[PDB]
Amino acid sequence: DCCLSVTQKPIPGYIVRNFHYLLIKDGCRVPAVVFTTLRGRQLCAPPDQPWVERIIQRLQRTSA
């Protein structure tokens, strides 16, 4: 179990430092998108929610 708790509800973009994708083999039951907050809190998010794609598309434009 790699996710203490998936969030149902949208996280504000401005809170998110970055994302990483974790697989079964990473020690997860199901694959998970992990958002790391500015404070360093891991928030697992549902890969199928448009609000998750939506944050990742900003981390992509503002990226590096």
Curated annotation (Swiss-Prot):
Tissue specificity of this protein: Expressed at high levels in the lymph nodes, thymus and appendix. Intermediate levels seen in colon and trachea, while low levels found in spleen, small intestine, lung, kidney and stomach.
Primary site of residence: secreted
Compartmental location: Secreted
GO cellular component: extracellular region; extracellular space
GO terms assigned for molecular function: CCR chemokine receptor binding; CCR10 chemokine receptor binding; CCR7 chemokine receptor binding; chemokine activity; chemokine receptor binding
Record-annotated disulphide pairs: C2-C28, C3-C44
Keywords: Chemotaxis, Cytokine, Disulfide bond, Inflammatory response, Secreted, Signal
Gene Ontology biological-process entries: antimicrobial humoral immune response mediated by antimicrobial peptide; CCL19-activated CCR7 signaling pathway; cell communication; cell maturation; cellular response to prostaglandin E stimulus; cellular response to virus; chemokine-mediated signaling pathway; dendritic cell chemotaxis
Protein's job: May play a role not only in inflammatory and immunological responses but also in normal lymphocyte recirculation and homing. May play an important role in trafficking of T-cells in thymus, and T-cell and B-cell migration to secondary lymphoid organs. Binds to chemokine receptor CCR7. Recombinant CCL19 shows potent chemotactic activity for T-cells and B-cells but not for granulocytes and monocytes. Binds to atypical chemokine receptor ACKR4 and mediates the recruitment of beta-arrestin (ARRB1/2) to ACKR4.
Quaternary structure, from the entry: Interacts with TNFAIP6 (via Link domain).
Family: Belongs to the intercrine beta (chemokine CC) family.
The name this protein goes by in its record: C-C motif chemokine 19
Naturally occurring in which organism (per UniProt): Homo sapiens
Species classification: Eukaryota, Metazoa, Chordata, Craniata, Vertebrata
